[PDB]
Amino acid sequence: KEKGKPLMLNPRTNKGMAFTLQERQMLGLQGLLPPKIETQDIQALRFHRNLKKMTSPLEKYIYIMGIQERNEKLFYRILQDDIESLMPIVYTPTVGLACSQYGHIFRRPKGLFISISDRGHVRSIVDNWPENHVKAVVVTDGERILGLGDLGVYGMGIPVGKLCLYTACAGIRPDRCLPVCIDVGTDNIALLKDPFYMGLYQKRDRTQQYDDLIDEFMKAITDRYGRNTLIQFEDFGNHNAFRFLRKYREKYCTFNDDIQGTAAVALAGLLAAQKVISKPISEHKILFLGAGEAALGIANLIVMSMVENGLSEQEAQKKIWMFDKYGLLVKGRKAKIDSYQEPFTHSAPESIPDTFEDAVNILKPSTIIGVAGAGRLFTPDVIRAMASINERPVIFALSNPTAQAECTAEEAYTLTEGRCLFASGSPFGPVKLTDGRVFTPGQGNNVYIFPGVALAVILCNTRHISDSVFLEAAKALTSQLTDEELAQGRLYPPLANIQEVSINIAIKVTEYLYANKMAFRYPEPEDKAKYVKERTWRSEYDSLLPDVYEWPESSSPP
Amino acid sequence: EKGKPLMLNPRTNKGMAFTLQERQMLGLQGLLPPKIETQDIQALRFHRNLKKMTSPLEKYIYIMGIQERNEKLFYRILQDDIESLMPIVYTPTVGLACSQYGHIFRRPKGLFISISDRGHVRSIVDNWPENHVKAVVVTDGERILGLGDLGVYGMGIPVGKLCLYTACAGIRPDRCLPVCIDVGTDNIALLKDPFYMGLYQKRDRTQQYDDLIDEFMKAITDRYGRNTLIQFEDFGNHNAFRFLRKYREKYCTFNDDIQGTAAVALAGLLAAQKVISKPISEHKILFLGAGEAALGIANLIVMSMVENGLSEQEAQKKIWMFDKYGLLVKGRKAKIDSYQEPFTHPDTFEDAVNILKPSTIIGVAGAGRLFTPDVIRAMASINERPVIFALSNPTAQAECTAEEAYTLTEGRCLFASGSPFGPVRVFTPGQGNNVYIFPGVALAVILCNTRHISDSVFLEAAKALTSQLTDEELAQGRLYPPLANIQEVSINIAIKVTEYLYANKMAFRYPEPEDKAKYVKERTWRSEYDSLLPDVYEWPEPP
Amino acid sequence: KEKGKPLMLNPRTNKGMAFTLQERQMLGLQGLLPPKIETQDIQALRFHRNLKKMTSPLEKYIYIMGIQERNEKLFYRILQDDIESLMPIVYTPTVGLACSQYGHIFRRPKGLFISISDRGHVRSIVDNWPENHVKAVVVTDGERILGLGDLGVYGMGIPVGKLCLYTACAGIRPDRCLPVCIDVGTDNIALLKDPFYMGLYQKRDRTQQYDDLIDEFMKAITDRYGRNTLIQFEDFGNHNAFRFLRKYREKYCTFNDDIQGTAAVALAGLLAAQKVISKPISEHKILFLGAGEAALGIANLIVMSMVENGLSEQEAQKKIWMFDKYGLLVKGRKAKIDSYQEPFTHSAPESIPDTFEDAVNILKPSTIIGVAGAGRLFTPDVIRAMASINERPVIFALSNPTAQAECTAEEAYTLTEGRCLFASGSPFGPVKLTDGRVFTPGQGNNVYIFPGVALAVILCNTRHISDSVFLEAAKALTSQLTDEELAQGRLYPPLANIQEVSINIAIKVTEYLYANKMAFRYPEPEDKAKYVKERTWRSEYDSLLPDVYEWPESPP
Ligand SMILES: NC(=O)c1ccc[n+]([C@@H]2O[C@H](COP(=O)([O-])OP(=O)(O)OC[C@H]3O[C@@H](n4cnc5c(N)ncnc54)[C@H](O)[C@@H]3O)[C@@H](O)[C@H]2O)c1
Ligand SMILES: NC(=O)c1ccc[n+]([C@@H]2O[C@H](COP(=O)([O-])OP(=O)(O)OC[C@H]3O[C@@H](n4cnc5c(N)ncnc54)[C@H](O)[C@@H]3O)[C@@H](O)[C@H]2O)c1
Ligand SMILES: NC(=O)c1ccc[n+]([C@@H]2O[C@H](COP(=O)([O-])OP(=O)(O)OC[C@H]3O[C@@H](n4cnc5c(N)ncnc54)[C@H](O)[C@@H]3O)[C@@H](O)[C@H]2O)c1
Ligand SMILES: NC(=O)c1ccc[n+]([C@@H]2O[C@H](COP(=O)([O-])OP(=O)(O)OC[C@H]3O[C@@H](n4cnc5c(N)ncnc54)[C@H](O)[C@@H]3O)[C@@H](O)[C@H]2O)c1
Ligand SMILES: NC(=O)c1ccc[n+]([C@@H]2O[C@H](COP(=O)([O-])OP(=O)(O)OC[C@H]3O[C@@H](n4cnc5c(N)ncnc54)[C@H](O)[C@@H]3O)[C@@H](O)[C@H]2O)c1
Ligand SMILES: NC(=O)c1ccc[n+]([C@@H]2O[C@H](COP(=O)([O-])OP(=O)(O)OC[C@H]3O[C@@H](n4cnc5c(N)ncnc54)[C@H](O)[C@@H]3O)[C@@H](O)[C@H]2O)c1
Ligand SMILES: [Cl-]
Ligand SMILES: [Cl-]
Ligand SMILES: [Cl-]
Ligand SMILES: [Mg+2]
Ligand SMILES: [Mg+2]
């Protein structure tokens, strides 16, 4: 119906002003573009110049996402050019604001919307998706959008943004990516009264119908695209996130980045710290502020790391303590202890702490991990206590956004006199102490892990993702940190290098999957690096010029 | 492009206004969020998102983005807020957009025909995907109103112009064709700009230029028909007049900068005459300027005078012009071309006013506040009701302000401007906007299958514009109908021009309608969504 | 979505092996065709060779129509190459046999099917037709397929075949042609019991629903395509055909070829005969065998011609007699005479004849016209009587099919010793007499009239078609007979020349329409011949080669 030449109308093939003169003439585009032939380089520079003239992150978001619908290769190029700056525009924290502020005007689909009203008919919706070879699905129900809570269908930006990073960071083919928003209602009263809300006007269905709908989705996706289709859950509520991971992980190819990706990036930072503090693992003691999704994810992966290094499971668990909103998790406390928290709930020490500071002084941890999301609870006295107890205290302030962090880099470095090994969830710039020393703290961003893991799983035709895959990814991340970087105080490789980092993780994870009988792509490649690098999708333009050539044309017909 | 055509095609796409049944039957279920909206709701969302934006440029970018997604929604939004949005989608915002942002292409915006394509223009015209073009707007970017030579960075102008063809007069958008002709630019900044989107050469001013324009006119009419309306916009003055003269009897063509300007200015003068009722033979017009606008307006004034019973010669004798080189008089120092000769019969303009004693002064100089307090007072001295038109744009280049005009004449002046002014005993001054004329004229010409456009058409359009003023409006000193009513005004102008065309044997659409009002109103394009629901029904109830 | 290159898959644009090497490479067809580049000339010769190895007319039909669905321009080239021989294959009498024998396997739509079950929803069916600029519609309900009777939806082929002749003969653009079959049931008992019948299993609806459906169709077509859209009715039952022509001719742009085309082609033949027999019109006497729809249509057009040449209507009517299955139409006879027959019913002569031979001897006509559909009733005694009464007797045997014709050409020329001016509606070949003289009999084929009339009406944006248009067409046809042809007693131009003949008719009719204020296309062309010839559709392939060229030979 859309009248015009398909190759310029389709964002997947469209090159815009980068179509060559001969391409334009042969493909019937001559006159439909201005009389200037550009390269992708020039198009990209025009974009970057224009973006600088816009004020709010939201204006930027609207501009850059517009390009995804016009010229796909230009879009990914622009993103890759300025990846560190643009990742928080296209994804968290900007993405979640955009729908609520602006909404959207549709032309091309953004992804699949599956509502509770569609129960019994989900396969029909999946069959409406235009692409036939989906390899990566990211799904949300919008209940727990990181930093915003329940946005209902206004969270469908989150899977879209996530998959932009799958492609930009690890070269997963954009045409094989499928964002999905599950709409079972919203408990956000403001949205239910909003005439411009784009979802169902009902509270969240929490009946068996909810579970049945998620089941129907999983079956429909894998019926169409295959049982090895990667399905990643994102921004579900805590109960749902954990139980769906448990329900599906041995039946489908699935992971939850909020739980498992978090665990791996955190662990990687701790393994980097161990490069400085090389004392035996038997002497480490980890104290968490918080006992929620992040704490449990991280702690369970620390235990697997410790078990690999000679400790028994039970002994490893005894080196991890947690302190939540109600205090120290000890056996027989008043506050509730769920089954996930039970292995880290130990017999009370002689003195029972009231405050986190008291807990530090009594337990004497080597490491504190802040995942409470409740502001500056790593107080000056907590930080000082850590530096008094340990020569090189490990302090991870992972809560986001910056306002919710347990402390700043500034506080950490200054109050420990440059001795702390520090990492954060939110971005902090260099810290100069008065004695001249400069510290560059790392950010434990989930983007270090999920692109590379996803690529490896897909390329290996892997069918289930064990926690041990995330342990391997954590080790592969840390293995890329140079000596010079560690000396600067970095516990993570630079974010600017995310493309190279992701590919290197994919190679290591691919080696692991083949070595542990988790791959099904045979023949098995002899050189895993070559295998991965040859399959990554490239943002450079292809030639679309028809092949025109003379035949020899040297006897005539009778 | 993989997906459902009806959704991907902006001409048919309804977005969230696709109904539940439409979505299911057409295979769209799940490709849109689970909310059924109306066009009304989509429009309200857009208006909110726009009111939460500040930069005219950023508004332009956002609005024009809608055109490439959902055509009906785009035009709905324009129509809803037409007075405020016309300055965004057209002059003066549109000229700024390209130079500052450029464009990222997906869908074609229109045709680009370069001097490098000489000999091959027909193949370019044949690449345009629409088969039934009725309205072409063409520029070479040489004289963008307010900005000068922007070369290819002025394709935005035809685009925005044709948006107003549709929004104001209901000309079908699929039958509109914007055209930019690129023969180079003399803008040195552009020639050194790596982001410039045109040919890196000075303007070709050889015979090759004339030949390319000829080739263009032939190619367009070869494909689409000899009656295809071709409107010239933002050419340099020499080229504008000479091309109008060259093509007007050979093709269906007009130049809005010359003829539209003339008509809208005349309409204002006619509205003033209704209030003043000064005997036409006692009128004397003094122009500040003797360029394109002046010659255009003067020629139409003469035609108006002649139809009322003056001879051409005596009508011309009532018009004087005063340019940058002083008064235009026979045997002066400065150059007097043959276009100026009819109006060539004091060292400052103030002196000119005092020695000639005009009833009307028309400011088309583009050179700032040359209607000084002195000039105004001297007009108010000579005349009971002075006519002062300060047409130069933008606001800062105007000959005087509205407040200045009324204050210094004790509210006795009949005043109009090219640039906008708020109410100033309250006087509500009118803005002589070209949008009053071109949409209605273009619609009438198209619906009538007219083949050539006489100057009398623009005279008729001027009278039809003035006739829509109410007595109340005239008593407030308003010389132009409210811009908010541009749709109604444009249709009314179209009806009057349609009647004129049939009566003077310039229409070729037969049979001829008995009721021209109905004829025009039934043919205007509508931005309301249509039903796309397949027709499903049971049959009545086999060896 | 049919995967591949649209230009190749679409029969309208497809050139097959005539795609040039450069076209194939640039359009992404290289390797999808054999490595040989042919011209349309070679493709046509291959077809013609293959056709000769087909035996039955049915087999030839299936083969040639297959090409329509593959390569439209090749199809029309082929039809034009061998037009005289192929018109009887693509149209009557072969076409009606095809569905009954074979049915059809559908891919592309052949045309629109509108059933009585679709009443109230006809517009949505018309909206499903993929072409947006239809100028020519041919519609049937399948009730009276010429020579075959009620075939129901198995008469789908007739509108298809007719429109093929619109294109091939007059250059009406094929994408602007729309065949339509109205299915309201069938009275054919054989079809009702046929598990392979492709229509509704019911008797024909003869209620108000039938009339309402036809009205809904007319409105739906003109609502979509415009009030000037030409709608031609074909192979309706006689009475339905007549009443619908009356109902719609002043409201829509419509004609019925069975009524009006027939009358025009018959008249043309008679006008040709009159050029040979200089006798003044007032001395002609015409006797019809039959007094039905064909007799009345022809007679009414003869009268219009006679009135134009100085006779009063009443006096013109007095020159025409009719003899039906009950005998001569005379005032006061026992057998009913209906109101339409009354103008040609006269006071009985001295003797009332019992047989047609007796009627010939008693009335002594100059001309007999057979339209009884009852077999060989122009007996040798009838023929000999005509040749003893008249030096040059005019004998038209127009009944169909051939078995029902009143006599053969052989019979007519031999028994009149070569003196008769003869025409039939059947394909009789040349007749050689013993003295060596060869006679080529005229065929009153409607294809002489309908293509040229259709083209003129469309090109002029004509809105209604008067009977006077068919009179003009008849004169325009006869005007093309050369002096040499007139001497040899040819009453029609050669069928081989049908393209040229049709265009010449269209030019004359266009002139007529403009001169009588029946055209609405303005500006009016000064030169009507040029106007028409520049607008006829051509079967020559166009170039589909993209335009590739160098530009004349940048800040960093
Ligand atoms: N940087 C990263 O890669 C990353 C990854 C995941 C989560 N996070 C951040 O971690 C934080 C927590 O996320 P989550 O999903 O685990 O949250 P959660 O709601 O699942 O867990 C919160 C926990 O904090 C405890 N808590 C709250 N207030 C407290 C207080 N004042 N003192 C002690 N404990 C308190 C609660 O009892 C609970 O155990 C958030 O800020 C989130 O952004 C960062
Ligand atoms: N299997 C097919 O449908 C198909 C179709 C055409 C060609 N081929 C060819 O067959 C060979 C093997 O086919 P294959 O597709 O299994 O390749 P592969 O086996 O090398 O790829 C391994 C897996 O990763 C997927 N994959 C590869 N690169 C990807 C990327 N960048 N983003 C997302 N997923 C990616 C593949 O779909 C597959 O599941 C290749 O030479 C290929 O060109 C296969
Ligand atoms: N009117 C349009 O919709 C249209 C569309 C595109 C281009 N044009 C151009 O306008 C000029 C005149 O075009 P026009 O269509 O008005 O032609 P026209 O006015 O010369 O033709 C008169 C009428 O005959 C029809 N017609 C012409 N040739 C025909 C054929 N071979 N078969 C069937 N119908 C036929 C036309 O559709 C029209 O109704 C040409 O230069 C043409 O390229 C017109
Ligand atoms: N409101 C409308 O509908 C409308 C339409 C067209 C043009 N305009 C305005 O009219 C103005 C003139 O446009 P144009 O195309 O006629 O310009 P132009 O270049 O064609 O003519 C300019 C004329 O002004 C004279 N001039 C310049 N500076 C002068 C000075 N200081 N003193 C005296 N004379 C001086 C020049 O000699 C020349 O005769 C512009 O500001 C434009 O915005 C308004
Ligand atoms: N001519 C065709 O190609 C065509 C195709 C399909 C249907 N029809 C029907 O045939 C009849 C004849 O219509 P017509 O189009 O010849 O004449 P019209 O009376 O409908 O319109 C007169 C002229 O104005 C044009 N026009 C009408 N509305 C317009 C608009 N809103 N914007 C721009 N141009 C506009 C037309 O193209 C035509 O040139 C109508 O009933 C129409 O629906 C015509
Ligand atoms: N396009 C056409 O429909 C067309 C064109 C030319 C010729 N024809 C043929 O002309 C013939 C008549 O068709 P029609 O529609 O006028 O038929 P009809 O049924 O309307 O009229 C037949 C007439 O012949 C008379 N008749 C029947 N048997 C007779 C007999 N034995 N002796 C004398 N008269 C007799 C009937 O009484 C009646 O007057 C058919 O063979 C038909 O195919 C048809
Ligand atoms: Cl571009
Ligand atoms: Cl929308
Ligand atoms: Cl072939
Ligand atoms: Mg495939
Ligand atoms: Mg069309």
Residue numbers in the entry:
A (entry chain C): 22 to 575, 577 to 580
B (entry chain D): 23 to 367, 374 to 452, 458 to 574, 579 to 580
C (entry chain A): 22 to 574, 578 to 580
Sentences from the paper on this structure:
Malic enzyme 2 (ME2) is a mitochondrial enzyme that catalyzes the conversion of malate to pyruvate and has been proposed as a therapeutic target. Malic enzyme 2 (ME2) is one of three known isoforms of malic enzyme (ME1, ME2, and ME3), and one of two mitochondrial isoforms (ME2 and ME3). A major function of the malic enzymes is to convert malate to pyruvate, serving as a metabolic shunt to regulate TCA cycle activity under fluctuating external stresses. Due to this flexible and comprehensive role, ME2 has increasingly become of interest in cancer as a potential therapeutic target.
We solved the structure of ME2/NAD+/NPD-389 and ME2/NAD+ (holoenzyme) at 2.45 Å and 1.89 Å, respectively. Both structures display the canonical malic enzyme tetrameric assembly, with NAD+ located within each active site cavity and buried within the tetramer interface. Analysis of the more solvent-exposed end of the active site is more complex, with the 4-OMe-substituted phenyl less sterically restrained and with two alternative NAD+ conformations observed at different sites of the holoenzyme structure. In chains C and D of the holoenzyme, NAD+ displays the same localization and conformation as in the NPD-389 structure, while in chains A and B, the nicotinamide group of NAD+ is flipped approximately 180°, forming polar interactions with Arg165 and Asp279 that would clash with the observed inhibitor binding mode. Interestingly, the active site magnesium cation appears only in conjugation with either malate or NPD-389 binding, but is otherwise absent in complexed ME2/NAD + structures, even in the presence of high MgCl2 (10 mM) concentrations.
